Every structure is written in structure tokens, then in C-alpha cells.
Design a protein around this ligand. Structure first.
Ligand SMILES: *[C@H]1O[C@H]([C@H](O)CO)[C@@H](O)[C@H](O)[C@@H]1O
Ligand SMILES: *[C@H]1O[C@H]([C@H](O)CO)[C@@H](O)[C@H](O)[C@@H]1O
Ligand SMILES: *[C@H]1O[C@H]([C@H](O)CO)[C@@H](O)[C@H](O)[C@@H]1O
Ligand SMILES: *[C@H]1O[C@H]([C@H](O)CO)[C@@H](O)[C@H](O)[C@@H]1O
Ligand SMILES: *[C@H]1O[C@H]([C@H](O)CO)[C@@H](O)[C@H](O)[C@@H]1O
Ligand SMILES: *[C@H]1O[C@H]([C@H](O)CO)[C@@H](O)[C@H](O)[C@@H]1O
Ligand SMILES: *[C@H]1O[C@H]([C@H](O)CO)[C@@H](O)[C@H](O)[C@@H]1O
Ligand SMILES: *[C@H]1O[C@H]([C@H](O)CO)[C@@H](O)[C@H](O)[C@@H]1O
Ligand SMILES: *[C@H]1O[C@H]([C@H](O)CO)[C@@H](O)[C@H](O)[C@@H]1O
Ligand SMILES: *[C@H]1O[C@H]([C@H](O)CO)[C@@H](O)[C@H](O)[C@@H]1O
Ligand SMILES: *[C@H]1O[C@H]([C@H](O)CO)[C@@H](O)[C@H](O)[C@@H]1O
Ligand SMILES: *[C@H]1O[C@H]([C@H](O)CO)[C@@H](O)[C@H](O)[C@@H]1O
Ligand SMILES: *[C@H]1O[C@H]([C@H](O)CO)[C@@H](O)[C@H](O)[C@@H]1O
Ligand SMILES: *[C@H]1O[C@H]([C@H](O)CO)[C@@H](O)[C@H](O)[C@@H]1O
Ligand SMILES: *[C@H]1O[C@H]([C@H](O)CO)[C@@H](O)[C@H](O)[C@@H]1O
Ligand SMILES: *[C@H]1O[C@H]([C@H](O)CO)[C@@H](O)[C@H](O)[C@@H]1O
Ligand SMILES: *[C@H]1O[C@H]([C@H](O)CO)[C@@H](O)[C@H](O)[C@@H]1O
Ligand SMILES: *[C@H]1O[C@H]([C@H](O)CO)[C@@H](O)[C@H](O)[C@@H]1O
Ligand SMILES: *[C@H]1O[C@H]([C@H](O)CO)[C@@H](O)[C@H](O)[C@@H]1O
Ligand SMILES: *[C@H]1O[C@H]([C@H](O)CO)[C@@H](O)[C@H](O)[C@@H]1O
Ligand SMILES: *[C@H]1O[C@H]([C@H](O)CO)[C@@H](O)[C@H](O)[C@@H]1O
Ligand SMILES: *[C@H]1O[C@H]([C@H](O)CO)[C@@H](O)[C@H](O)[C@@H]1O
Ligand SMILES: *[C@H]1O[C@H]([C@H](O)CO)[C@@H](O)[C@H](O)[C@@H]1O
Ligand SMILES: *[C@H]1O[C@H]([C@H](O)CO)[C@@H](O)[C@H](O)[C@@H]1O
Ligand SMILES: *[C@H]1O[C@H]([C@H](O)CO)[C@@H](O)[C@H](O)[C@@H]1O
Ligand SMILES: *[C@H]1O[C@H]([C@H](O)CO)[C@@H](O)[C@H](O)[C@@H]1O
Ligand SMILES: *[C@H]1O[C@H]([C@H](O)CO)[C@@H](O)[C@H](O)[C@@H]1O
Ligand SMILES: *[C@H]1O[C@H]([C@H](O)CO)[C@@H](O)[C@H](O)[C@@H]1O
Ligand SMILES: *[C@H]1O[C@H]([C@H](O)CO)[C@@H](O)[C@H](O)[C@@H]1O
Ligand SMILES: *[C@H]1O[C@H]([C@H](O)CO)[C@@H](O)[C@H](O)[C@@H]1O
Ligand SMILES: *[C@H]1O[C@H]([C@H](O)CO)[C@@H](O)[C@H](O)[C@@H]1O
Ligand SMILES: *[C@H]1O[C@H]([C@H](O)CO)[C@@H](O)[C@H](O)[C@@H]1O
Ligand SMILES: *[C@H]1O[C@H]([C@H](O)CO)[C@@H](O)[C@H](O)[C@@H]1O
Ligand SMILES: *[C@H]1O[C@H]([C@H](O)CO)[C@@H](O)[C@H](O)[C@@H]1O
Ligand SMILES: *[C@H]1O[C@H]([C@H](O)CO)[C@@H](O)[C@H](O)[C@@H]1O
Length: 274
């Protein structure tokens, strides 16, 4: 029955709460301070603008397409909820809780996406000054960490099929895990105690394995470098002609496949195992 348009809600607006149920619709809503939009099962919000002290709740079976989050606003994608092509600007936060799903999120300068407690995000775009945080059962797939962008894979966080482009950075902490990371030219992946598997490092890209960190099954293509620091470990690295594995004193590598023209640099004698 219900279906709203160009409604502004919150503070000293006409209405404070907006609720959506099965079949309801909301378009170009503007959520301002004290404003709450609740998108419930079978509800659909579209083009919602979320400003300081405004919140959009996406509950189970709810859907929110093209929400745009600004300075001090919040999108909560709860269990069973779905958010598509969300845009997060300076000071905006999208949080994906247990059972929630975000697809195609664009995170802009100073914007934050938190994927926690078993939420999932696919195809996040992490641009310059943007940040993505993944933790405690949260899983992110096909994140593009673009120039200026940063992804934090924290304890219990998991990232798959991440792509790192020019000055894009991925930080994998203790208890964090990354799989099938692609490091393009200018990309940096840092294992600050965390684990990586199935990394590919193309020309200009770098993986840095620090204390407690561990890389498995890494391919270093021409111009790529895996850099292993003290008490970092790597295994099953293949170094292609023109690529490099550099191991600092006290770092370790094993099951190294060194192709002809692949550089290996060691600073201790028992550093690398072929
Ligand atoms: C919208 O859906 C229901 C409403 O009566 C119309 O279908 C409620 O159950 C919900 O709480 C929400 O208000
Ligand atoms: C944003 O401002 C709102 C508005 O001024 C009405 O009091 C508050 O309700 C919010 O809590 C927030 O401070
Ligand atoms: C949207 O409807 C929900 C629905 O009744 C699911 O039980 C409510 O839980 C929300 O609070 C909102 O009214
Ligand atoms: C939310 O309501 C939905 C609605 O009837 C159709 O979109 C159901 O699909 C869900 O099962 C839930 O009750
Ligand atoms: C409500 O609308 C959503 C969206 O705004 C459509 O572009 C759909 O994704 C849902 O299926 C529902 O129809
Ligand atoms: C909902 O409305 C949005 C609005 O024009 C924002 O200014 C569009 O950007 C979306 O494409 C959608 O149609
Ligand atoms: C959306 O509805 C949710 C409800 O439990 C689904 O059954 C709430 O948990 C959210 O806070 C919001 O009201
Ligand atoms: C909302 O959460 C789930 C969602 O519909 C997933 O399709 C289901 O457990 C229920 O429909 C619930 O109302
Ligand atoms: C709410 O609509 C979503 C739609 O794709 C958003 O545009 C669906 O994916 C959800 O399953 C739900 O129907
Ligand atoms: C919802 O709007 C989005 C728009 O960019 C938000 O400003 C589109 O990207 C979506 O495809 C949809 O039209
Ligand atoms: C909007 O205000 C936000 C915050 O409320 C300031 O304390 C800033 O973080 C944003 O940068 C923007 O100015
Ligand atoms: C979505 O639902 C969540 C729900 O209570 C989890 O069980 C809330 O944490 C969010 O605030 C939002 O309402
Ligand atoms: C949270 O949301 C749903 C819950 O049982 C009812 O809102 C489940 O479908 C999800 O798997 C998650 O547990
Ligand atoms: C939002 O969540 C959908 C999930 O099935 C709940 O409706 C997925 O199809 C998507 O992750 C969409 O982005
Ligand atoms: C997030 O918590 C959900 C919720 O607490 C209900 O059990 C679970 O369904 C999920 O499995 C996840 O752990
Ligand atoms: C949001 O999370 C979804 C998860 O299955 C729970 O709905 C994924 O399927 C989507 O790809 C998105 O990450
Ligand atoms: C990216 O630009 C942001 C700006 O506010 C967007 O309008 C800053 O908040 C960031 O610090 C960064 O410079
Ligand atoms: C979701 O789940 C956890 C919750 O605090 C307790 O189960 C944490 O991992 C996150 O902080 C988030 O609240
Ligand atoms: C998530 O969507 C992405 C989309 O094109 C936005 O950049 C794809 O590239 C991913 O493969 C995934 O489908
Ligand atoms: C991307 O550009 C950001 C700037 O805020 C854009 O407005 C910088 O903060 C980053 O260092 C990067 O150059
Ligand atoms: C990852 O960080 C999460 C984030 O700070 C909000 O929950 C926590 O949930 C985890 O405990 C972990 O540190
Ligand atoms: C958040 O909880 C993670 C999850 O429960 C299991 O991977 C915990 O192991 C961590 O303590 C993290 O802080
Ligand atoms: C990565 O490219 C960025 C791009 O021009 C803006 O997104 C620069 O800001 C960075 O300095 C880097 O060159
Ligand atoms: C994972 O945790 C790390 C930890 O606090 C110390 O190694 C940080 O370095 C990372 O930035 C991320 O928070
Ligand atoms: C993350 O924590 C690890 C700690 O031993 C937890 O097991 C360290 O080995 C890492 O160096 C990092 O501080
Ligand atoms: C860290 O654990 C990840 C996690 O189980 C996600 O499913 C794996 O994908 C990684 O390969 C790594 O072992
Ligand atoms: C690889 O190319 C990068 C380019 O800007 C983006 O592909 C350079 O920044 C690197 O230095 C390297 O030459
Ligand atoms: C990342 O490190 C993991 C380590 O044992 C800590 O969990 C391995 O399981 C992975 O294969 C990779 O070495
Ligand atoms: C990996 O991280 C190290 C970190 O400080 C562990 O304490 C750096 O010293 C290394 O240079 C590398 O970035
Ligand atoms: C390298 O540094 C790690 C620690 O996190 C630095 O504070 C340790 O876990 C290692 O055992 C080693 O000291
Ligand atoms: C291997 O090829 C690299 C890459 O494919 C693009 O230039 C070169 O950078 C190296 O010099 C090497 O010849
Ligand atoms: C191994 O092959 C490299 C080739 O360019 C791979 O693209 C050369 O650069 C090396 O000198 C060696 O011949
Ligand atoms: C590489 O470092 C490893 C790490 O420090 C764990 O103790 C050692 O196990 C290896 O012997 C090598 O020194
Ligand atoms: C080892 O073999 C390399 C060969 O071309 C790989 O196909 C040479 O480039 C090296 O110089 C060396 O002969
Ligand atoms: C590696 O070789 C060293 C040797 O004396 C010189 O190559 C030893 O110092 C190491 O313990 C290890 O045998």
C-alpha cells in the first residue's frame, strides 16, 4: 500500500520514524539527525541520502539500493538484509552485521565500511582516503583497494580475491586471513602477523611479510617482490624470471621455486629452502 518520495525525515521534520514492510517503497528519502528508516522484510528503499545523526536500518528480507551515506550518518545492514551500490562519503559508515550482505559498495574519501560478526561484502570499492575493516567472522570478496585505499583484515577477518592497485594497501593482522590477493603495480600487502594464501604479485607490486606473518603459495611475476622480514615466514613461493624474493636476516622461506632469472636475496645462510 505505502510508497514515499522525496520525503525528508528526522530532527524537526514532519515524521521521525519511517517503516517499510512487504511491498512498501521509498525513493530519494533524506534521513537527517534523529531520523530512523527501518527497511523490513519485502521493503525496498532506493536513493536514500543519510546525513549526520541519521540511521538506515536494513532488516531481514529488506533491501536498500543506492543509499548514500554522509558525515556522521549510518547504514546498518542486519541479518538477512541486503544493501546494493551504497555510497559512503566522508564520515559516513556502512556496517554489515551478522547475516547481512553488501554488494558493490563505493567507499569515498574518509568513508568507512565495517564488515563484522559474519557479515559479507562483495565488490566493495575502496578509493583514496577510504577504509574497509573486516573482523571476527566478517568476510569480504572481490574488494578493489584502489589508490589511497586501505583494507584492514583484523583478527577473525577474511578477505578473498582482493585486488590491490596503485598505492592501495591491505593490512592483514594476527588471526586475519587473505586468499587470492592480486597485487598490481604500486600495491602493498602487509602481513602484520596475518596469513596469506594464493597471492600473485605482478610488476611493481609488493608483499611484506613481518613478524608472525605467513605467506603460502605465492607467485612473483616479473617486477614483483615478496619481502620477508625478521620472524616472517613464507612457503611455496615461485619466483618467475624478473621477479624477486628478498629475505632479511631472521626471516624464512621454504619450498621456494626459483625459475631462471628469478632473483633471491638472503642475509643469513639457512634462510631459504629450495
Ligand atoms: C510495516 O508492515 C506492517 C504494517 O502493518 C503494514 O503491512 C508492520 O508489521 C511492520 O511493523 C511495519 O510497520
Ligand atoms: C542529531 O540531532 C537530532 C535532532 O537535533 C533532534 O534532537 C538528535 O535527535 C540526534 O540525537 C542527533 O544529536
Ligand atoms: C520493519 O518491520 C519489521 C518486521 O515487523 C519484522 O518482524 C520490524 O521488526 C521493524 O522494527 C520494522 O517495523
Ligand atoms: C518478510 O516478508 C516477505 C514478504 O512476504 C515477501 O517479500 C517474506 O519473503 C519473508 O519470508 C519475511 O516474512
Ligand atoms: C524493492 O525494490 C528494490 C530495488 O529498489 C529495485 O531497484 C528491489 O531490489 C527489491 O526486489 C524490491 O522490489
Ligand atoms: C534514486 O535517486 C537518486 C537521486 O537522483 C540522487 O540525487 C539517483 O541517483 C538514483 O539513480 C536513483 O534513481
Ligand atoms: C529491522 O527489523 C529487525 C527485525 O528483528 C527482523 O525480524 C530488527 O532487528 C532491526 O533492528 C530493525 O527493526
Ligand atoms: C528474515 O531473515 C531471513 C530472510 O528472509 C532471508 O531470506 C529469513 O529467516 C526470514 O524471512 C526473516 O523474516
Ligand atoms: C531485497 O531486494 C534485493 C535487491 O536485489 C536489491 O535491489 C534482493 O537481493 C533481496 O534478496 C531482497 O529481495
Ligand atoms: C541506484 O543508484 C546508484 C547511484 O549511483 C547512486 O547515486 C546506481 O549506481 C545504481 O545502479 C542504482 O541506480
Ligand atoms: C561532517 O562532520 C563529521 C563529524 O561530525 C565532525 O566531528 C566529520 O567527521 C566530517 O568530516 C564532516 O565534517
Ligand atoms: C539491524 O538489525 C540488527 C539486529 O538487532 C541484529 O540482531 C541491529 O544491530 C541493527 O541496528 C539494525 O537494526
Ligand atoms: C540473522 O538473520 C536471520 C535471523 O534468524 C532472523 O532475523 C537469519 O536468517 C540469519 O542467518 C542470521 O542468523
Ligand atoms: C544483498 O544481499 C542478498 C542476500 O541474498 C539477501 O537478500 C544478496 O543477493 C546480495 O548480497 C545483495 O547485495
Ligand atoms: C552472526 O550471528 C547470527 C545471530 O546471532 C543468530 O544466531 C548467526 O546466525 C550467524 O551465524 C553469525 O554468527
Ligand atoms: C552480502 O552478504 C551475502 C551473504 O551471503 C549473506 O547474505 C553475500 O552473498 C553477498 O555477496 C554480500 O557479500
Ligand atoms: C579524503 O578526502 C576527505 C574529504 O573530506 C572528502 O570531501 C577527507 O576527509 C580525507 O581525510 C581525505 O583527504
Ligand atoms: C558483531 O559480533 C560480535 C559481538 O560484539 C558479540 O558477539 C563482535 O565481533 C562485533 O563487535 C560485532 O558487534
Ligand atoms: C562484485 O561486483 C564487481 C562489480 O563489477 C563492481 O565493481 C565485480 O567485478 C566482482 O567480480 C563481483 O561480481
Ligand atoms: C588519494 O587522494 C586523497 C585525497 O584526499 C583526495 O581528495 C589523498 O588523501 C590520498 O593520499 C591519495 O592521494
Ligand atoms: C576485529 O575488529 C572488530 C571490530 O573492531 C568491531 O567488532 C571486532 O569485532 C573483533 O574483535 C576484531 O578485533
Ligand atoms: C573476533 O572473534 C573471532 C571469531 O570469534 C573466531 O575467529 C575471534 O577469534 C577473535 O577474538 C576476534 O577478536
Ligand atoms: C594513486 O592514484 C591516486 C589517484 O590519482 C586519485 O584516486 C593518487 O591520489 C595517489 O597519490 C596515487 O597516485
Ligand atoms: C590488524 O591489527 C594490527 C595490530 O594492531 C598490530 O599488528 C594492525 O597493524 C593492523 O593495522 C590491523 O589493525
Ligand atoms: C599479531 O599477534 C601475533 C600474536 O602472537 C598473537 O598470536 C604476533 O605474532 C604478530 O606479530 C602480531 O602482533
Ligand atoms: C586464511 O583463512 C581464510 C578463511 O578461512 C576464509 O574462508 C582462507 O581463505 C585463507 O586461505 C587463509 O588460510
Ligand atoms: C607499475 O605501474 C604503476 C602505475 O602507476 C600504475 O600501474 C607505477 O606506480 C609503479 O611504480 C610501477 O611502474
Ligand atoms: C597463512 O598462514 C596460516 C598460518 O598457519 C596461521 O593460521 C596458514 O594456514 C596459511 O596456509 C598461510 O601460511
Ligand atoms: C612488516 O611489518 C614490520 C612490523 O613493524 C612488525 O613489527 C615492519 O618492520 C616491516 O618492515 C614490514 O612492514
Ligand atoms: C616478531 O614480532 C612479533 C610481535 O608481534 C612484535 O611485537 C612476535 O609475535 C614474534 O614472535 C617476533 O617477536
Ligand atoms: C619482467 O617483465 C616485467 C613486467 O612484465 C613489465 O615491465 C619487467 O618490468 C621486468 O623488467 C622484467 O623484464
Ligand atoms: C628471465 O626472463 C625475464 C623476462 O623479461 C620475463 O618477462 C628477463 O627480464 C630476465 O632477464 C630473464 O631472461
Ligand atoms: C624462519 O623463521 C621462523 C620463525 O621465526 C618461527 O620461529 C623459524 O621457525 C625458522 O627456523 C626460520 O628462522
Ligand atoms: C636460465 O634460463 C633462462 C631461460 O631463458 C628461461 O626460459 C635464461 O633467461 C637465464 O639467463 C638462464 O639461462
Ligand atoms: C647457514 O650457514 C652458515 C654457515 O656458517 C655459512 O654459510 C651458518 O652460520 C648457519 O647456521 C647455517 O648453517
Amino acid at each position: 500500500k505505502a510508497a514515499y518520495d522525496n520525503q525528508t525525515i528526522g530532527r524537526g521534520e514532519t515524521s521521525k520514524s519511517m517503516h517499510l514492510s512487504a511491498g512498501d517503497t521509498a525513493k530519494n528519502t533524506t534521513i537527517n539527525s534523529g531520523g530512523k528508516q527501518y527497511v523490513s522484510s519485502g521493503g525496498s528503499a532506493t536513493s536514500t541520502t543519510i546525513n549526520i545523526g541519521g540511521v538506515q536500518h536494513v532488516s531481514s528480507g529488506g533491501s536498500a539500493t543506492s543509499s548514500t551515506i554522509n558525515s556522521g550518518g549510518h547504514q546498518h545492514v542486519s541479518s538477512g538484509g541486503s544493501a546494493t551500490n551504497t555510497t559512503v562519503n566522508n564520515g559516513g559508515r556502512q556496517t554489515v552485521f551478522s547475516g547481512g550482505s553488501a554488494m558493490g559498495t563505493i567507499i569515498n574519501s574518509g568513508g568507512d565500511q565495517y564488515v563484522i560478526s559474519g557479515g559479507s561484502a562483495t565488490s566493495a570499492s575502496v578509493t583514496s582516503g577510504a577504509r574497509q575493516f573486516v573482523s571476527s567472522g566478517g568476510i569480504v570478496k572481490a574488494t578493489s583497494v584502489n589508490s589511497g585505499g586501505r583494507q584492514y583484515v583484523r583478527d577473525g577477518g577474511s578477505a578473498t580475491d582482493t585486488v590491490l592497485n596503485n598505492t592501495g594497501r591491505q593490512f592483514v593482522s594476527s588471526g586475519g586471513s587473505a586468499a587470492k590477493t592480486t597485487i598490481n603495480s604500486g600495491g602493498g600487502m602487509y602481513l602484520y602477523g596475518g596469513s596469506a594464501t594464493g597471492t600473485s604479485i605482478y610488476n611493481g607490486g609488493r608483499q611484506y611479510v613481518s613478524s608472525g606473518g605467513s605467506a603460502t603459495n605465492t607467485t612473483v611475476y616479473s617486477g614483483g617482490r615478496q619481502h620477508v622480514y625478521i620472524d616472517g615466514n613464507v612457503t611455496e613461493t615461485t619466483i618467475t624470471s624478473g621477479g624477486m624474493l628478498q629475505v632479511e636476516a631472521g626471516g624464512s622461506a621454504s619450498k621456494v621455486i626459483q625459475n631462471s632469472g628469478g632473483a633471491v636475496i638472503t642475509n643469513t645462510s639457512a634462510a631459504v629452502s629450495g
